[PDB]
Amino acid sequence: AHVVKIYDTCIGCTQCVRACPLDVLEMVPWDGCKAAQMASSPRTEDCVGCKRCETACPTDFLSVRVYLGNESTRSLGLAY
Amino acid sequence: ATEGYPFVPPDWAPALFVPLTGLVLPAVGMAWAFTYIQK
Amino acid sequence: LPAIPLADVQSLSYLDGHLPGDMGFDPLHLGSGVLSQDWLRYAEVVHGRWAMLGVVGCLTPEALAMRGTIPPERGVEDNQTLLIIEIAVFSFLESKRYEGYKKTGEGGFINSYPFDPVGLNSPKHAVNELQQNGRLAMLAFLGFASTAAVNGQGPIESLQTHIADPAHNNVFTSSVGKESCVFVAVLSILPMLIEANKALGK
Amino acid sequence: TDYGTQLSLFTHHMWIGGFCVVGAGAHAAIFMVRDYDPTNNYNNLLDRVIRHRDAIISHLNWVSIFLGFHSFGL
Amino acid sequence: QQVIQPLNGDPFVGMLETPVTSAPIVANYLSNLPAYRTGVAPNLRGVEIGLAHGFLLAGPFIKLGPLRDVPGTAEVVGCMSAALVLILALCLSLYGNAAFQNQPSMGKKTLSGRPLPQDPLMSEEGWAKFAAGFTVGGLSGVAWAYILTQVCLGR
Amino acid sequence: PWKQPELDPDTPSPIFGGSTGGLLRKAQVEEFYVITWESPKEQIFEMPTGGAAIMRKGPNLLKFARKEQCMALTTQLRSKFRQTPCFYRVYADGKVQYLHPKDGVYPEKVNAGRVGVNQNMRSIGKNVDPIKVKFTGSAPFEI
Amino acid sequence: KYFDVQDLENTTGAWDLYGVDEMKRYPGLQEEFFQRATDAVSRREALNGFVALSAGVASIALFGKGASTLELPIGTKGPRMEKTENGKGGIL
Amino acid sequence: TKLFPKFSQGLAQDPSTRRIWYGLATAHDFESHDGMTEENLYQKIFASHFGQLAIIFLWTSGNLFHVAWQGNFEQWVTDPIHVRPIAHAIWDPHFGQPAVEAFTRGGASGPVNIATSGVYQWWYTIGLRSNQELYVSSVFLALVSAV
Amino acid sequence: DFLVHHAIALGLHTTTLILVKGALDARGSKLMPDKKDFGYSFPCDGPGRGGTCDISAYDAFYLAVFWMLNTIGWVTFYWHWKHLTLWQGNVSQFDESSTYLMGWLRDYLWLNSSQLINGYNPFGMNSLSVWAWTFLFGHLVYATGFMFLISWRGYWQELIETLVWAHEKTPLANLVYWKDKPVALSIVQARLVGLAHFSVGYIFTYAAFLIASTAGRFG
Amino acid sequence: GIGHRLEAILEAHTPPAGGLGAGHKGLFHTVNNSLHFQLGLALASVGTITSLVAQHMYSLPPYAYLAVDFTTQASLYTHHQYIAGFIMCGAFAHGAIFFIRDYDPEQNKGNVLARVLDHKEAIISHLSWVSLFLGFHTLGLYVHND
Amino acid sequence: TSDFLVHHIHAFTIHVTVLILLKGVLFARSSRLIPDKANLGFRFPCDGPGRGGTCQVSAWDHVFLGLFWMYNSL
Numbered sequence A: 001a002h003v004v005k006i007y008d009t010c011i012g013c014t015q016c017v018r019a020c021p022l023d024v025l026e027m028v029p030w031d032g033c034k035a036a037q038m039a040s041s042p043r044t045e046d047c048v049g050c051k052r053c054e055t056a057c058p059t060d061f062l063s064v065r066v067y068l069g070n071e072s073t074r075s076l077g078l079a080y
Numbered sequence B: 001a002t003e004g005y006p007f008v009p010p011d012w013a014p015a016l017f018v019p020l021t022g023l024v025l026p027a028v029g030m031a032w033a034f035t036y037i038q039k
Numbered sequence C: 001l002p003a004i005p006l007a008d009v010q011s012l013s014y015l016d017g018h019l020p021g022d023m024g025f026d027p028l029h030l031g032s033g034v035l036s037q038d039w040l041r042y043a044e045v046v047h048g049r050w051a052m053l054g055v056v057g058c059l060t061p062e063a064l065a066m067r068g069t070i071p072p073e074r075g076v077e078d079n080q081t082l083l084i085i086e087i088a089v090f091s092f093l094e095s096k097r098y099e100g101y102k103k104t105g106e107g108g109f110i111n112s113y114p115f116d117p118v119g120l121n122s123p124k125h126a127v128n129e130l131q132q133n134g135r136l137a138m139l140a141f142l143g144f145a146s147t148a149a150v151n152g153q154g155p156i157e158s159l160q161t162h163i164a165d166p167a168h169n170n171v172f173t174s175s176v177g178k179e180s181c182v183f184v185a186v187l188s189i190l191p192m193l194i195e196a197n198k199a200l201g202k
Numbered sequence D: 001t002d003y004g005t006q007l008s009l010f011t012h013h014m015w016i017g018g019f020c021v022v023g024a025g026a027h028a029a030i031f032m033v034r035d036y037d038p039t040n041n042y043n044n045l046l047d048r049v050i051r052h053r054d055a056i057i058s059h060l061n062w063v064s065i066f067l068g069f070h071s072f073g074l
Numbered sequence E: 001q002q003v004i005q006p007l008n009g010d011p012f013v014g015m016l017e018t019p020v021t022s023a024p025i026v027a028n029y030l031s032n033l034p035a036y037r038t039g040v041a042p043n044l045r046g047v048e049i050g051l052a053h054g055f056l057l058a059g060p061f062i063k064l065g066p067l068r069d070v071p072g073t074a075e076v077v078g079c080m081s082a083a084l085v086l087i088l089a090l091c092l093s094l095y096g097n098a099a100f101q102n103q104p105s106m107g108k109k110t111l112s113g114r115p116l117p118q119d120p121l122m123s124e125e126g127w128a129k130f131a132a133g134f135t136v137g138g139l140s141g142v143a144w145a146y147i148l149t150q151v152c153l154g155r
Numbered sequence F: 001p002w003k004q005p006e007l008d009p010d011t012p013s014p015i016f017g018g019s020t021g022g023l024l025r026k027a028q029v030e031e032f033y034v035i036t037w038e039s040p041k042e043q044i045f046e047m048p049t050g051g052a053a054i055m056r057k058g059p060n061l062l063k064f065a066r067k068e069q070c071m072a073l074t075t076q077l078r079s080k081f082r083q084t085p086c087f088y089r090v091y092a093d094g095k096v097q098y099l100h101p102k103d104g105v106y107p108e109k110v111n112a113g114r115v116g117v118n119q120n121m122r123s124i125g126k127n128v129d130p131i132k133v134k135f136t137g138s139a140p141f142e143i
Numbered sequence G: 001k002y003f004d005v006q007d008l009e010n011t012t013g014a015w016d017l018y019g020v021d022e023m024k025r026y027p028g029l030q031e032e033f034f035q036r037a038t039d040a041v042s043r044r045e046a047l048n049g050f051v052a053l054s055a056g057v058a059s060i061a062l063f064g065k066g067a068s069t070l071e072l073p074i075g076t077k078g079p080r081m082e083k084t085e086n087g088k089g090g091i092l
Numbered sequence H: 001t002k003l004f005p006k007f008s009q010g011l012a013q014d015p016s017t018r019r020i021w022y023g024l025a026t027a028h029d030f031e032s033h034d035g036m037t038e039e040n041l042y043q044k045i046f047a048s049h050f051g052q053l054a055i056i057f058l059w060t061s062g063n064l065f066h067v068a069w070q071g072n073f074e075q076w077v078t079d080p081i082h083v084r085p086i087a088h089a090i091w092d093p094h095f096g097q098p099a100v101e102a103f104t105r106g107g108a109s110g111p112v113n114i115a116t117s118g119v120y121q122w123w124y125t126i127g128l129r130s131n132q133e134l135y136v137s138s139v140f141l142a143l144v145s146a147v
Numbered sequence I: 001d002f003l004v005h006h007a008i009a010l011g012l013h014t015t016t017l018i019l020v021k022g023a024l025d026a027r028g029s030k031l032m033p034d035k036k037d038f039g040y041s042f043p044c045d046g047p048g049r050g051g052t053c054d055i056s057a058y059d060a061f062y063l064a065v066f067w068m069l070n071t072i073g074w075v076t077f078y079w080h081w082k083h084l085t086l087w088q089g090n091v092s093q094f095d096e097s098s099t100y101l102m103g104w105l106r107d108y109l110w111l112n113s114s115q116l117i118n119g120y121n122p123f124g125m126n127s128l129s130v131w132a133w134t135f136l137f138g139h140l141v142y143a144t145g146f147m148f149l150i151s152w153r154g155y156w157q158e159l160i161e162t163l164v165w166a167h168e169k170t171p172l173a174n175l176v177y178w179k180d181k182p183v184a185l186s187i188v189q190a191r192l193v194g195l196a197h198f199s200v201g202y203i204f205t206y207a208a209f210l211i212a213s214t215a216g217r218f219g
Numbered sequence J: 001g002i003g004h005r006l007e008a009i010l011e012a013h014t015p016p017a018g019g020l021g022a023g024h025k026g027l028f029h030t031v032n033n034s035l036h037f038q039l040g041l042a043l044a045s046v047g048t049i050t051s052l053v054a055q056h057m058y059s060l061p062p063y064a065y066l067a068v069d070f071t072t073q074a075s076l077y078t079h080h081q082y083i084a085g086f087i088m089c090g091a092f093a094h095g096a097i098f099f100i101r102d103y104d105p106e107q108n109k110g111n112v113l114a115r116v117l118d119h120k121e122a123i124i125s126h127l128s129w130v131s132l133f134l135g136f137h138t139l140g141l142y143v144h145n146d
Numbered sequence K: 001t002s003d004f005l006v007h008h009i010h011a012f013t014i015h016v017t018v019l020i021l022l023k024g025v026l027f028a029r030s031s032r033l034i035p036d037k038a039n040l041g042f043r044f045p046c047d048g049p050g051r052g053g054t055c056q057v058s059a060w061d062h063v064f065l066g067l068f069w070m071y072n073s074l
Ligand code: CLA
Pocket: B009, B013, B014, B015, B017, B018, B019, B021, H058, H059, H061, H062, H063, H065, H088, H089, H090, H091, H142, H145, H146
């Protein structure tokens, strides 16, 4: 599926986890920001690629990136 | 033929070569291609 | 299989030589299926039967003085209705042959009699000699068909002319086939190309 | 006997009518997106229509293709 | 008191039982048709399907065609139908050698839908068997349409 | 949550007329999902496949074909009726898999019980160029 | 109860809403006529070979297009032909 | 898991029609094929180059053959201003009575189409004057294409 | 010839602008700085940050193909009209009627197309009928390309989903099934197919008109 | 023991007084190590000479009785010009592919290839000005005369 | 016969326009591809390049496509 990455320039606002409609990203604790939490993506195989996380990212440049790749039945959004 | 042998073709040439490459050749080509596309 | 067609040619992997007439020549891999080659083999032998009978079928009438050298049905005693009874008797006979072949293979019998060894002869060498003579007649009947190039000349008559002049009475020059030279040219260079390809692809 | 005004009036009224029907198709979707509450419509015509939308669209799709072939292939 | 409801008491599926399908006249008639019959042998199924199709693929071909105005040739214009059913048998065999691939066997799901077994027509050899029956049936149906169109009497 | 609640059958499913958009041949040949929740009263919700259905009291269970449909119904019940749903993924063999919430708290919290994955300690823009990752099959972000 | 985990071959939609099972359709010995008739083409390679050899019918069929009298080989007509095409020149 | 995109396992593991279409798109992007080195890339390019040269020579050989079989080259040499060049013959079972009568131009026995490629003037300028020289040169070009 | 030469200069500088901009801004821009990490032909980078439709260098080349076709069409229209007026001894027609675009449309596209469309009428046909047929064939290919250029993938994805439901729940046709799931063409593929249809129609229509209008009234 | 070296000529071609900075240093390895650069250069040269062939064949006919054939000249000119246009678009396409796939900035630092990339906004903006000038005035003169 | 042909042409174009508009209205709420299309609004660009691409999936986009077909029909 698609490859999602979270860079260290994250501020931990927890907006990408709220914008993800397939429960791909999560918030793990961190010790490098004021909120002491950084996003992660354990369910990468469920990424569909709608890029809502990138629109929800407030920092410049985006801390989360969705690099599209190979497509499967789950990533193509097929219901049949 | 006569004094023209080098690539000189018989009269019923397009009557048997056009009915071949226009129907037999694309049919066998598409059949082999479909079997190769599938597993 | 040890003989081989041209000089030394790598016999095909599918042909292990189990078949009695495995000359090691089998180009484009037309037959490689286990259940398909047996049926093809049955076809080849049935062909030889009709062709051998055919070669000596035209040889007899041609040797003596008669009509039909090139065209049949000069007169005859049965018209059209004959042709219908021909297909009827053959359909019954052929259905029996197919049924017999399915049971044991190498169907050699007349009407409905699974094995036909009247003469009590059936050794291995005779099975092989059937094939080699059938292959030969299948290749000889085409020369009988090739009387078109030779026109009015018949099979025995074409031989007679070739005896009178052995250089100006052959397919290479006396016939209208100038491409026979190109056939023997590519048939002569093809072997070397196969050995060359296989050798290069080490 | 005034072909200019005849052709002009016909063409003008036809264009105004077509523009209005496309606008109707637009506002129906606007209503369905904003003012559609799935509480006052439990088993009515609107709920049943939205329930078999797949059957409706597939049939309209087939009719469209059939008319195109039989009306343009000629 | 509606004639429309879900199937088996579970509505989350796409197939919603409507009057057309629910209809007993439609239910029994579809089951009677030669394709939905599972116990009958595949060769038999293919022959019946091929007979009906080979017969219907002639008329619209013999009335509208390149030689539809030449009297005897018009009857001879029905041969194309034979060529058509030949192309149909070739593509049917092509679909069978690729639908149920050797790698993919049953393809899963035994299917309940009332006490009854999986149709053997979906096997690898079953589709070839069907292809055979369809070929003989189509060739025979086209030949019957051509024989019947000359001795039909007052057609 | 504190233990993965095992999905169990014989749960009262919501009253709903027969829809048309759901459970095709993939829901049987490959996989399908199922969402369970608890309702405190009787209300009418909107299914993400057609019309509206009601909420049967007690437990509730619904089945869908895509994970996005279950996630859409999950966020609708969490923001409009203040509920706490959970869905599973049923495979073809019958292997049930817990899916949300995996940690069981919520996916937008911390809980200090999960390890971060797919993170780059560098900032975007510090990635090396396409020329450097040649025939390596890897990419700048992957590196 | 609307979903089951073990008997999933009946709760998802795996049904046959138009198929009955019976060993009888056609009359006795009629099937036998069609069995022997369809035995030869029963295999995949057999039918593909049948239509491959029957594909040569188009080649042979075109040769016997004399009965059809298709415009193609009947003639091009010497009396009337477009050898006067264009007005600048008689031929070109 | 199918096996048509042999050069890409990613597209080979695609359960949709996207595998077919993309299988015909990235077929020449040797720089992004599964398990490809610089040496393998350069050698693959060197082979495709020879394939292109072979098809180019085969195409020009076919042009010489068609003009030598149906073109009125010998008739065009004796009068290069009035007569029109002939590309090849036209065999169409879909043609009607008036199509066969109207498609016959340039002094031919059957329907043909006039050539706009301008190869007649080129061959007449370089030296080709007979209908046999084009024949022997066409077989020579086919031979060099095979090599 | 002054104005037409300026039109040729305009087409050259515009095509060069699109291609040079797509080549220089290929590895990054201010709207997308990590573009080099996305490859050469990607659909977009979502509808965020205003929207990034047609942002790859492949998309830039795709947009430049239309300008290249327009520039070559202008230079060939100029060549064909100047030679079309020189060959018939009416060199004063183009010199006095080539200054206004209505003169271009009347004396070039409308006057020289009298014999092309008359290939097949209800009074029979002629040698030019094949050119007349391909002259309309090119128009049909062009119009089909406009479909892939205007309509985008999401509308078609929903349509294909409805057709899938139709084939699954239909009697006597549910026996067969697709080996690969049917899906709509991708965004990049849709741009490529539309461009191919646009270029093929643009080429076939002009080749038919050129050969027919020249062959029809000359040798 | 005779001849020239391409790398030596490229390294020696650097004007003093910092006109081009590093000059053509590293350009030999940049061109030889990349395939899209060579493909873009070859397509640019081929696309230019194809148009040259088209412009010289109609003015200076090289074949006998070619000026009399009016359809042949038109078809040949149109064919060669369209082929040249497609090849010219491919040259710039491969140049963009080169910049994305095989352009490492650390190898050729401060040379002409990395130097033209520093004022890409200036180059693109001036191209935009020229295109706007020609478009506005050619369209305006045509509409005024119309 | 020509009146028959043009009348069938008119019926075909009317069916395509009603297909585009009715699809937009019936799928403007929530489709099977994008289940949360109602919360996305009525006039939105797309839903990103996921699922292969979801450009013009909004109800407003269907009206834009419809306008084109109404022009082609009238
Ligand atoms: C690659 C260029 C080319 C093209 C575009 C065409 C196009 C056409 N040919 Mg032609 N042909 C060609 C080359 C070409 N031919 C060559 C090189 C030969 C000599 C072998 C022929 C011999 C030929 C004949 C005899 C006839 C045609 C005919 C036709 C027309 C009908 C379509 C058809 O039946 O295909 C053509 C069918 C073929 C079998 C020819 C294909 C040649 C293959 C590709 C090469 C065969 C190998 C050969 C032994 C040479 C070895 C070289 C090899 C190693 C590359 C069509 C306009 C028919 C026609 O109607 O005339 C108008 C017709 O009867 N062609």
